Amino acid sequence: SLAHTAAEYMLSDLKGLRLELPLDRIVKFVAVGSPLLLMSLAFAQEFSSGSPISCFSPSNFSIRQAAYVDSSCWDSLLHHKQDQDKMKSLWPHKALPYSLLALALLMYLPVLLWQYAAVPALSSDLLFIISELDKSYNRSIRLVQHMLKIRQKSSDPYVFWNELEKARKERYFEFPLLERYLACKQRSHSLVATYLLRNSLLLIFTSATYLYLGHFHLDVFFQEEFSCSIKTGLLSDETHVPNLITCRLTSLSIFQIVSLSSVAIYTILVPVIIYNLTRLCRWDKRLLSVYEMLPAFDLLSRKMLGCPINDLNVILLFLRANISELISFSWLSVLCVLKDHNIDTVVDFMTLLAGLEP
Amino acid sequence: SLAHTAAEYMLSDLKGLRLELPLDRIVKFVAVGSPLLLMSLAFAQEFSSGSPISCFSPSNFSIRQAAYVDSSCWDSLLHHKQDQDKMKSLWPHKALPYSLLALALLMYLPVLLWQYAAVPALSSDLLFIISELDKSYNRSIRLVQHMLKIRQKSSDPYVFWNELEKARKERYFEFPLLERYLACKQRSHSLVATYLLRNSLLLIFTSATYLYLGHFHLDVFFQEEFSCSIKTGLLSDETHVPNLITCRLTSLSIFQIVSLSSVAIYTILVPVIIYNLTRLCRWDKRLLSVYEMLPAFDLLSRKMLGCPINDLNVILLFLRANISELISFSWLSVLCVLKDHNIDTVVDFMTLLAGLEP
Amino acid sequence: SLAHTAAEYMLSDLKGLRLELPLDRIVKFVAVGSPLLLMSLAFAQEFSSGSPISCFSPSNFSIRQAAYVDSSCWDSLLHHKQDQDKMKSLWPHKALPYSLLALALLMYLPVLLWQYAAVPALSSDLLFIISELDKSYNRSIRLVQHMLKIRQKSSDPYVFWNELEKARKERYFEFPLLERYLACKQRSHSLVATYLLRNSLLLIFTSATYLYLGHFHLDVFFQEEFSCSIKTGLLSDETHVPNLITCRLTSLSIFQIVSLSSVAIYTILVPVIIYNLTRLCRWDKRLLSVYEMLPAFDLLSRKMLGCPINDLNVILLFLRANISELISFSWLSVLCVLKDHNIDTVVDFMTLLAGLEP
Amino acid sequence: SLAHTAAEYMLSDLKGLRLELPLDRIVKFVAVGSPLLLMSLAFAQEFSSGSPISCFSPSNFSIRQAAYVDSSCWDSLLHHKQDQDKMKSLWPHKALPYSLLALALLMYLPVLLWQYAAVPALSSDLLFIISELDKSYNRSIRLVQHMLKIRQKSSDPYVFWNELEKARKERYFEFPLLERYLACKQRSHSLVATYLLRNSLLLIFTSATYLYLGHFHLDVFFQEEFSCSIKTGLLSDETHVPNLITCRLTSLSIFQIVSLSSVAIYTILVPVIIYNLTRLCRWDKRLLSVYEMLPAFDLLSRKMLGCPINDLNVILLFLRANISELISFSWLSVLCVLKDHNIDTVVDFMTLLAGLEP
Amino acid sequence: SLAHTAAEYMLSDLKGLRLELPLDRIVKFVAVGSPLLLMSLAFAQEFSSGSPISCFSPSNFSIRQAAYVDSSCWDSLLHHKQDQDKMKSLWPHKALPYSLLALALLMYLPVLLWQYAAVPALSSDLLFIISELDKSYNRSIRLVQHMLKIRQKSSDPYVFWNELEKARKERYFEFPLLERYLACKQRSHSLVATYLLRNSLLLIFTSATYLYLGHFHLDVFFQEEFSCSIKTGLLSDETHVPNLITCRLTSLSIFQIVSLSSVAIYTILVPVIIYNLTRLCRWDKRLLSVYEMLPAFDLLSRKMLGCPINDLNVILLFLRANISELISFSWLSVLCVLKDHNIDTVVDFMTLLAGLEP
């Protein structure tokens, strides 16, 4: 089947960066491979259909004449009802595999759009910001370790409340380039639009699938028998039956099961995309408490104001997923004992200096 | 068959950590691959079914008419019993492969939940704790070897009973960061809930399988013949039999064997998951005797009090499985001659110093 | 099928250079693999045709005589209409796979032409220009860093407005070979012609496909029945039917669907190639503002005059796609905070010196 | 067939240790792969069965009626003997492949039990003991080479009979940790039980196979013809034969040959497992003569007393198989010229010092 | 089919040298793989022939008798025309795949001849000449850089017109071995004959293909019906038809299409080989202007006189294709600004010294 090769080529799982969130990957997998799995199950493996149509031809007919009768009604699915002559067609039965392949191809467009229009710029931003952030370790322990060593040599105001301004507001404790980079990227609105487009396309395609199933299916759903006509052409001047009644659709059960599964999977999938869309509607301040003390990480939490729909929100969203790679997968994560500014001033008297690598 | 590919993709057997216990791996294997094996055996290989239904049509019928009769009763499995007209359906015979595939997919959900919601945090905790514990070797032999060297130079109270406090309660013999990490992690209850959910989902799915087999099977279990109707539509105005009696289900034996195997395997599997759940209901103190003397390992055995349902219990459970990697796969394991505090005070007069690497 | 192997061999995705733009790659993929996919779908997988023709032979005929009748009409598709004796042929039905393969082979010619007649010279140009451009980093920060260090030691005209000529017009700040290379290559018109030929060939082939579909198809499009003759030779002296009426074409639906898909895909593809052609009709000056200050990059923006149809335009087009490799994927890209010469004179007081690697 | 994949996955042939004896590997191979080979031969390759049942239906019957008769008797194997109405079933003919697969799966349980419950502890023991034993080379040639160098400088009692106590009972010639390890593991009885269970399970499964073949086979062994009934249901009110006599089992020869091969292979296999069990009933003292002189190897031969059913016996059994890896695959093995304590005292005057590496 | 394996084995695309020109590779590909592709298309994939002959046997005949009639006429293709008894044979229909395979094998002979009789000597010459030529870089910039450094220190005749003879005619500026090698190789005529043979063989084989198609085809081209005889032997004394008229050739369309494609492809291919032959009829002096100034490259352009049919012509032809490998893929190619000896004397005042690697 073409489903196996289609799943092999498309939907197949810099140099270290994570440019896709896990939930987006799960959504893409279950939205692209599901129609391929349905197509593979419906027209291969278990249910060897043989012919999808059976005909009750007269016993006078030969084998080849019966084959002609049953071969010319599969490609001309028309119920010649006696109710004038409203010849209802049953084309979805013939078109189902085409529709499944088309849906599988359609669901892959937002992935390509994201990969082509948003990955490179986001990768550049992530690389620059990570390279600037990894310099923040030896700037609070290799620079502010002469804070407690001096603390024991004096008492109160001029040893721990008048030195946090002469040292924090110092040249080696400042990141002027990164602050400007973040301020400029907060104004931008380019990469935030690709996210919204990528989610809205999936919503629109789900709506189109619902419309297709509700308009074309759900009408020929309990119909398994139709009467055709053979003498509608050059065979009209022949002595045989004008209505070859009772052609039976053999694969109606597969039709119904595929339709129901297609409805259920996308109904389950709908709220996840809405949650993904709403992820960008708020400023995430879960760990802002520990960020505002570190030198470089203070700028990340400083610029959380106004409308949260910006490029900075997307950059932060993709940065928290990469902040656990190998080097920030350290003291930063180990700083879980510092979440319990009066008490906060004295609580860090042990942890920061004891978190050193050696 | 799709069973081979499904087993190839799913259920297919950081950088050194063991994040899954062997019993969980065995349970997952025998709970996911068993329905796939049943599906592969039932509808391939040995028993080439051909058609799952046979019909005794009149000899007047042609070959194509007999094919029509036997093709229109497989998709319309309805026993037209004379007992009004309670047309009992035999749909499980047609739905069995669907059900097996659905069960195989359903049993894979807890694995994904564990891999997505609990693996990263547990990996971080394990990495930090292992890195902190590996420093405990050169802190009891490279720090307390001037304990027996001094012991021979003096006698009793001030050489082996008044020095175990000036040296044990010393700066280089203390781990203040790890103690706080463990104290804070004992309060947490986040990673303990994923374990319980992962086991309870398997229990619930087993219960659902029992309900499905007891309600839909076990009724059509000894029934192998049914009488159908063909003149229930456009063929009603025709001169042939109005009850095509004795349609025989050819694959009844496979049905029965698959049902019995499905019952037996999960009945055997049930108590293992309960044992896995109850593993977390107690404080495991098997080797606490040897832990309480080592500097860093004393903290692990100190915090064993109160309710055992914590994050510390899960972390300890996963730590004992990794404590035999390559470096703790040493003296710690070799300390099996120290399990036989009066006698304990003097028993270690040989082993600890003789366990040195050179 | 041959479609799978054809897609495997052709259309299968120095040492670092990008010699093909992403849009060209997408166009080539969707223009070459689409007929192969149509051929694979139409004559394999889902629709097992069997025989593409059915015949209603008399019941007196044997099985072998009926096979003879239906086999001698597939290779002699001629409608013996009674309207003199205008025997209309239906050869496109027989020729469709041949035509699809021919179209797939035809669409691959411009790719070969570009790969054989334009890749090596462009690669040489790109290598030389990139090697010359990578020397521009340590010529504005390692050469003009004694510009602000001197700026604080003096005031105005002779420290920042009379030194930008004694240093910019200096031997170490000049690239005389690269300027001559660019001036000579602006006059050339060789590699610019291959681009135009590569696009025009695709346009011409699309026009030919439209002509083929409009002349040969669209006439036999709703015709599914034709009456043939068998007694047109050595069988003329025999007692059987002189017009074997009602031969039916079984695969008419596949014919129609393939024709419609072929029309739609190329109609969608047409404007992209026109956009690619018009990309070369203008001087792209998006980032010329930041180019004119850097030493080596000033020459690239200086030579933007006159007719834009040159070799320099193509070289620049392929250079902007490679300017983000690993080393220019640096300060150059990070210089996004310098896009907001009065203000421009003083705005760069921070960024250029702060963009240093250490 | 599933036999090929089953043999590929299971039964498929630290970092240097040998944790399985060759005889155990041979037994496992010939006990697991033999039923798989029988299944592959019986139901594939050479003997293409087609249908395992043939029926002599009346000539009045149609093709489909004959197919119905022969299809409804394979799933209802019941001999309607006239001798009341003892309908003997012939279900083993239908169940043979299931039984072969079940036996192949059953024979794999002891392998899993050994791999899961005994391999890690034995690996730890072997690693520690090998690391301790590899230190014994430079302790009898690099420590007792000042024994013959001094021997030529003196005469008799105080040069070769009064120095073998001041040097053998010396600190550098003692292994106090390994002696305690061996003394403690001689008391243990944990890993010795897994060996016995692994062998007893194979014996029990062989007994079960014998019971199965003697009870269910050997009764339907020379029976190839049975008379069935079709009018035992909804077909009872029909005019045709009430006893469709002479259904013939086509594959009786394969049945007999498979049964005989299954009997013979396991009958041949039985004594090997008994020999493996009895291997642990004695203290192996084949090379104890040369062990008792080497410093570290003296402890291995010292602790051979009392009941031989211990953990030390299993450890020694697995140690002799690994004592020829690369480094003990040396002088130890080359010491075959020292097997011919009066003569023994003087015989080693050449070999030990001449066995040096340079 | 054997076509796939034949294309896999033959026609499948030192250590750096290019011993085949691109046009020769294209010609070989399109001349060898084209008959293989035609054979694959004609007798596989799309057009499943079944039987290439159909017979209109009398209805009295059985199925086996009709099979006998149609099986004994495929191997005895003889038209028993009534026009004496000129039994025309139609053997090309039966021989077409043999002929295609033979043509594919025949077209591969010149490739083998070139690979066996000309590749090694040409490789040796190319290696020696390239190794001698790569020494020419540090002999005009590392040897004649004291030409402009001295030029500024003097004026005219004895600084730039009397020093170009004392330095150019110097020992370190001479290549006496390479000149003798080229002078000797210009006299040789061995490797030039293999080129001519390789092209003439292809021309002769194309002529043979034309003769074969014009003599054996083109006569049985519109003939699709022939009358055979069966009573031409032991069946002559039987009561049935003496002329089994109207045997029909089913695959006539494939015959015609294959013949036309074979004609067209080789007609298109003919002029390319003539162009390849005429490539050696002239001295290529496109870049001789820049060659005559470089020390070692002067000898290459000096020896261009007399008849151009030599070994030197072939060596130069294969040398220009390799002159862009990695090291001559440098200044030599970059010297494109020096093509615009009065002006030539002064034009090189910039480029040669500025083309240095650092």
Side-chain angles (χ1 to χ4, degrees), chain B residues 62 138 220 249:
Chain B
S62 320
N138 65 28
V220 289
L249 304 140

Coordinates of all heavy atoms in Angstrom, one line a residue, chain B residues 62 138 220 249:
Chain B
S62 N -26.4 -20.2 -9.5 CA -25.1 -20.2 -10.2 C -24.0 -19.9 -9.3 O -24.1 -19.8 -8.0 CB -25.2 -19.1 -11.3 OG -26.4 -19.1 -11.9
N138 N 36.1 9.0 48.5 CA 37.2 9.7 49.1 C 36.8 10.7 50.2 O 37.4 11.8 50.2 CB 38.1 10.3 48.0 CG 37.4 11.4 47.2 OD1 36.5 12.1 47.8 ND2 37.8 11.6 46.0
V220 N -22.5 -15.6 22.1 CA -22.2 -16.3 20.9 C -20.9 -16.9 21.0 O -19.8 -16.5 20.6 CB -22.3 -15.3 19.7 CG1 -23.7 -14.9 19.4 CG2 -21.4 -14.0 19.9
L249 N -20.3 -20.5 10.5 CA -19.1 -19.8 10.8 C -18.0 -20.7 10.9 O -17.9 -21.6 11.8 CB -19.3 -19.0 12.2 CG -20.5 -18.1 12.2 CD1 -21.2 -18.2 13.6 CD2 -20.1 -16.6 11.9

